[PDB]
Structure 1
């Protein structure tokens, strides 16, 4: 059944494809809003209003009108019924006719599966509410006036015509054209909410007739009154007869984009289920996994997903998973594994593009530089190849930050040099911090945040804000300890800074709860650099210490067990996570490396992993290990981890590590 979807996709019109890609990118930002009504309710055998009209007709007459009633008498009959027979009979008929329990049809699940932000419906039923309830998502029900003020979430459910929730009483629901005429007089705030929500986002209609009624009001307001600054709404037509070409034109001028079903799938007249399913399917299958067929799509998509992160120096490989929305696992050694990609393999196909020599020629002129750039990105990052072809995979780390080397001589010469651009100023600020000259560096970050607001995507801005907060905390704890200890600190009543700096940072600072800064940056920022978000919380390391317990008993009590791990062993992977973490922190020049918590993390990691050479020392001389591990590869105390220990160990810690 998916294959037929592929065929119809490759047999769509060029007017369709732009609408599909528009819809899917709208979803990707979480900025899609449906408008669902009686069309879907028809599927679930939910009772239809015309049947109610016949019940009213038979209640006030004896037989139905001979033939169709009229194009003008559907509206008035219920009014007559209420006006002469009164309210109570109306209530009773509503209660008898409407009180039924039904299940949910799959179209509802499909519609919700595209994680819509807000839903605005005319369905008198509670069925869509039930569909929301089952799928674990929670939404606010706003049915009458009092609910509008008392909002309970940032996601909304607007039941325009009212609901039977509060009771089976007519006033709560819109049935009579008196209510249709005094709609503005009665329900102003709901109207304002509808107007604003339509204006602010992309709205997709479905399950609606072309004429109907509400469509008339929305188009009459939307199109004529406003200027040329709106996003055109989308509509799904599912009638049996195809829409004529000129009808498309007329509704195009009026400001709606039609997606006609009759050109999509062929069937009989009555198969409403199939048409709805097909139309919603052309959306749902291609979130973006399956429609990718030509090798050009592969490179455009991957470049779209990676190009923003070019600004940073390096991306932590373990974090790269979030880079692809949990589609593939990237292992620290340098391989890839498919875990959730249910579509045509793009990450797989990229490696074939990498190894390829001449089939790269089957490509356009503009993409070749893109492929080369991606090549450099993954080469610098550390991606090598794919799992089954992964053989010899020796790895050497290179932390290119001159600060980590501790070559302080070059740093001062670097500072006393003319600036060229903002990023150089950022490196300048970190280098000064490495020199510990905190105050002018603080004024520097203030200047950078002041200057870099006007420029492009504010990676520099966000990083500056985070580092500024960090230096604030460092100054706080530093002055706290200094003025708490007094002259006893260094045998001198040393006051490091002046009251001016203190007062300035206090009055400027006493605000700005960091815990929403990532929520404060524009949407393309949170989409494009969601990767960095983990730096925001004061919790960022504490996911790896979890993995140290791997070697506390399962590589330590298992060390007493004497079993051998084949291939990828816990000690080496933890040590590799260690290199990766230091590289990501230093080469991106974040001040968090200075803090005590990071010091403790490296302390634990180094101490626990170095507790491997003990094992058993002069043990029961085995024979199995000689065949696989002969001529023992001594754990070399290379300059990297030696520097690590030097920078992040206390002297008493040295005492314990030698004593044990």
Structure 2
């Protein structure tokens, strides 16, 4: 059945489910629950009470049929002529009962709503939230809006019975309905604002209800096409007629009819409630990749924001795709924790064959070209099973890595034309002997990046300027205390006025909250930049190096010599990925002491293993022609890495061993 339901969903139903699930993911979803859901669990319907009142008011029992106004009028007449304590007596007699929850409540909670809005006065959803473990602030009276313990609400618009079974806590007659806007100003305001700034799904109401139509009249006078159309989940025995469908859709609604989706009997209400509640919504929380163009579109939606950066570490890609795959330092992709369509396998298959690419539609071949260029520049090749002869290369284009001071002087002298140039220039000044000129330029870039952008240069400028401030302050500590002896003179590199201003500005800054204050779109588009504000960026690489060290050293103690590829090629590949990423993205982390300690321990292990394998060409080779050839030799990049990150004692330690 369920497969058939997913298959019979028209384009509109699929789009509606897409939007609902995406909004649930973003944390902006809300449910408007009616009375049908509360009748699924047995609970005295209002009409029943309307009968009793009638039987009490006129001696006769119920006759014929009741109109819409009679429901709100007969209780009113009974209140008027008999009194208040009889109304309350009947209310208490009928409503003081305990009833169990039902699966629909559990499913609704499983959807992870942000708030909840309901027109029921029973506490079924309260017990549901109390069992599921969710915490909501219950609002059922005017005094509860001001003193709210949390930031998420369970909003009973018409009241409840948490302060007694009197008729003043609820809204159940015509007088209460007429004077609503005057007795409930704050609750009405709160409901309206929540509707304005959230995605709303109706459940268990049924069109033609007083509340749905009252709110459709507000949306016509209180809106200028500046709102998002609510959704509706209709559960009626027979399918909705087309005329009513168009009339209500034109009137600000998006209907989803469960009767059309699946077939059932007249009185199988729970069946149709479940067939559309969550049996379709949660199960459809996965993607919908089934075509050769949706693959490109999805991968583009994920990779496009990273065109702002120059390079991406391969390990970090594991976070971009949410653990759907493994990306290896040698350039191979390996499936992991993905149960849906394999879109990386499809992408590489399309890469190999030209005809499959020709099958792509217009405006989608250029997105493939962009993704292909990105993956080629970053060094991603293919899936692991189809691996060829993987090669190793090094190329860092940073002018600062190569120590070309005069060219950076010239570059800083020249005029800039974009904020990218100023970003690079601020990196340079700092790499030259200027903390005062780079600080000012970072603050200036932070000023001028107000214009529409990704928010990437802004965030990275903030991080870099905080780091430069830290560097300035530590020098002063060793300038007016140790510098007085190092040179024999009180070197005053920065004025007291400057050091005072920078301290006043950087007094409230907390790098711990810099990413949490960013717009939510940036946080869901650049979550790999979050690790650039702490010691979490070098955690996976140090845990790996601490392990490969214990492994290589145990083999050198045993006296074993393998004839395959080195066991420390991963140490070399990770080291050069970290260097390219930090220097090509102009980050001041390249100056930190923990990064210098990481590069020193990685380079020491490689040279020690190279000495062990040089002398083995006499033990194995000397006893038998059979032997090996692969090795490690110094080149430009290795010389400059040792010269910038090792102390003379560190070099002497390796020269004795």
Q: Which is worse superposed, 60-69 or 473-482?
A: 60-69
Task: State the secondary structure of the residue aligned to 2:350.
Answer: helix
Aligned residue in 2 for 1:657: 654
Q: Which is worse superposed, 555-564 or 260-269?
A: 555-564
Task: State the secondary structure of the residue aligned to 1:628.
Answer: coil
Given that 1:38 and 1:207 are in contact with CA atoms closer than 8 Å, whether structure 2 keeps it comes out as yes
Q: Give how far 1:205 is off.
A: 1.6
CA gap of 1:220–1:572, structure 2 versus 1, over 3 A, is same
Q: Which is worse superposed, 588-597 or 35-44?
A: 35-44
CA gap of 1:515–1:631, structure 2 versus 1, over 3 A, is same
Given that 2:55 and 2:62 are in contact with CA atoms closer than 8 Å, whether structure 1 keeps it comes out as no
Which digits, 9 at most, give the CA deviation of each residue in 1:130-174, with x for residues without a partner?
444455544333343343233444433323233445566655444
Q: Which is worse superposed, 16-25 or 272-281?
A: 16-25
- Equivalent pairs counted in the alignment come to 657
Q: Give how far 1:411 is off.
A: 2.0
Q: Give how far 1:430 is off.
A: 0.8
CA gap of 1:378–1:619, structure 2 versus 1, over 3 A, is closer
Q: Which is worse superposed, 526-535 or 602-611?
A: 602-611
CA gap of 1:150–1:512, structure 2 versus 1, over 3 A, is farther
Q: Give how far 1:99 is off.
A: 5.5
Aligned residue in 1 for 2:583: 586
Q: Which is worse superposed, 568-577 or 439-448?
A: 568-577
CA gap of 1:491–1:10, structure 2 versus 1, over 3 A, is same
Q: Give how far 1:622 is off.
A: 10
Distance 1:627 1:206 in 2: 81
Q: Give how far 1:494 is off.
A: 1.0
Given that 1:603 and 1:649 are in contact with CA atoms closer than 8 Å, whether structure 2 keeps it comes out as yes
Q: Which is worse superposed, 262-271 or 70-79?
A: 70-79
CA gap of 1:352–1:505, structure 2 versus 1, over 3 A, is same
Given that 1:337 and 1:387 are in contact with CA atoms closer than 8 Å, whether structure 2 keeps it comes out as yes
Given that 1:308 and 1:528 are in contact with CA atoms closer than 8 Å, whether structure 2 keeps it comes out as yes
Task: State the secondary structure of the residue aligned to 1:530.
Answer: coil
Which digits, 9 at most, give the CA deviation of each residue in 1:300-340, with x for residues without a partner?
11111111111101122111122123322223232223333
Q: Give how far 1:478 is off.
A: 1.9
Distance 1:629 1:652 in 2: 39
Q: Give how far 1:443 is off.
A: 1.9
Distance 2:140 2:602 in 1: 56
Q: Give how far 1:581 is off.
A: 2.0
Given that 2:17 and 2:281 are in contact with CA atoms closer than 8 Å, whether structure 1 keeps it comes out as no
Distance 1:528 1:139 in 2: 29
CA gap of 1:632–1:15, structure 2 versus 1, over 3 A, is closer
Distance 1:205 1:150 in 2: 28
CA gap of 1:608–1:70, structure 2 versus 1, over 3 A, is same
Aligned residue in 2 for 1:219: 216
Distance 1:586 1:109 in 2: 51
Distance 1:602 1:184 in 2: 69
Q: Give how far 1:40 is off.
A: 2.5
Which digits, 9 at most, give the CA deviation of each residue in 1:355-375, with x for residues without a partner?
122122212121111111110
Given that 1:515 and 1:536 are in contact with CA atoms closer than 8 Å, whether structure 2 keeps it comes out as yes
Given that 2:330 and 2:390 are in contact with CA atoms closer than 8 Å, whether structure 1 keeps it comes out as yes
Aligned residue in 1 for 2:315: 318
Distance 1:117 1:566 in 2: 59
Q: Give how far 1:385 is off.
A: 1.0
Q: Which is worse superposed, 323-332 or 563-572?
A: 563-572
Given that 2:72 and 2:172 are in contact with CA atoms closer than 8 Å, whether structure 1 keeps it comes out as no
Task: State the secondary structure of the residue aligned to 1:396.
Answer: coil
CA gap of 1:262–1:319, structure 2 versus 1, over 3 A, is same
Distance 1:604 1:461 in 2: 34
CA gap of 1:151–1:604, structure 2 versus 1, over 3 A, is farther
Given that 1:289 and 1:341 are in contact with CA atoms closer than 8 Å, whether structure 2 keeps it comes out as no
Given that 2:17 and 2:284 are in contact with CA atoms closer than 8 Å, whether structure 1 keeps it comes out as no
Which digits, 9 at most, give the CA deviation of each residue in 1:230-289, with x for residues without a partner?
222222222122222221232234322222333322332223233233333586257564
Which digits, 9 at most, give the CA deviation of each residue in 1:595-639, with x for residues without a partner?
223333434555567676799999999999999994264344454
Given that 2:30 and 2:113 are in contact with CA atoms closer than 8 Å, whether structure 1 keeps it comes out as yes
CA gap of 1:60–1:367, structure 2 versus 1, over 3 A, is same
Q: Which is worse superposed, 554-563 or 327-336?
A: 554-563
Q: Which is worse superposed, 490-499 or 563-572?
A: 563-572
Distance 1:23 1:56 in 2: 42
Q: Which is worse superposed, 460-469 or 225-234?
A: 225-234
Normalised by the size of structure 2, how large is the TM-score? 0.87
CA gap of 1:124–1:658, structure 2 versus 1, over 3 A, is farther
Aligned residue in 2 for 1:230: 227
Distance 2:619 2:54 in 1: 96
CA gap of 1:274–1:399, structure 2 versus 1, over 3 A, is farther
Distance 1:634 1:100 in 2: 82
CA gap of 1:461–1:282, structure 2 versus 1, over 3 A, is farther
Aligned residue in 2 for 1:244: 241
Which digits, 9 at most, give the CA deviation of each residue in 1:73-96, with x for residues without a partner?
323444566667766666666566
CA gap of 1:436–1:84, structure 2 versus 1, over 3 A, is farther
Given that 1:551 and 1:608 are in contact with CA atoms closer than 8 Å, whether structure 2 keeps it comes out as no
CA gap of 1:111–1:659, structure 2 versus 1, over 3 A, is farther
CA gap of 1:579–1:6, structure 2 versus 1, over 3 A, is farther
Given that 2:34 and 2:204 are in contact with CA atoms closer than 8 Å, whether structure 1 keeps it comes out as yes
CA gap of 1:289–1:148, structure 2 versus 1, over 3 A, is same
Q: Which is worse superposed, 24-33 or 620-629?
A: 620-629
| Structure 1: gaps (5+ residues) | none
CA gap of 1:262–1:583, structure 2 versus 1, over 3 A, is same
Q: Give how far 1:433 is off.
A: 1.5
Task: State the secondary structure of the residue aligned to 2:272.
Answer: helix
Q: Which is worse superposed, 301-310 or 176-185?
A: 176-185
Task: State the secondary structure of the residue aligned to 1:478.
Answer: helix
CA gap of 1:36–1:451, structure 2 versus 1, over 3 A, is same
Given that 1:162 and 1:174 are in contact with CA atoms closer than 8 Å, whether structure 2 keeps it comes out as yes
Distance 1:158 1:428 in 2: 54
Given that 1:110 and 1:280 are in contact with CA atoms closer than 8 Å, whether structure 2 keeps it comes out as yes
Aligned residue in 1 for 2:546: 549
Q: Which is worse superposed, 78-87 or 465-474?
A: 78-87
CA gap of 1:268–1:515, structure 2 versus 1, over 3 A, is same
Given that 2:596 and 2:645 are in contact with CA atoms closer than 8 Å, whether structure 1 keeps it comes out as yes
Q: Which is worse superposed, 331-340 or 57-66?
A: 57-66
Which digits, 9 at most, give the CA deviation of each residue in 1:446-481, with x for residues without a partner?
222222211322222221122112111111222222
Q: Give how far 1:203 is off.
A: 1.8
Q: Give how far 1:207 is off.
A: 1.8
CA gap of 1:435–1:622, structure 2 versus 1, over 3 A, is same
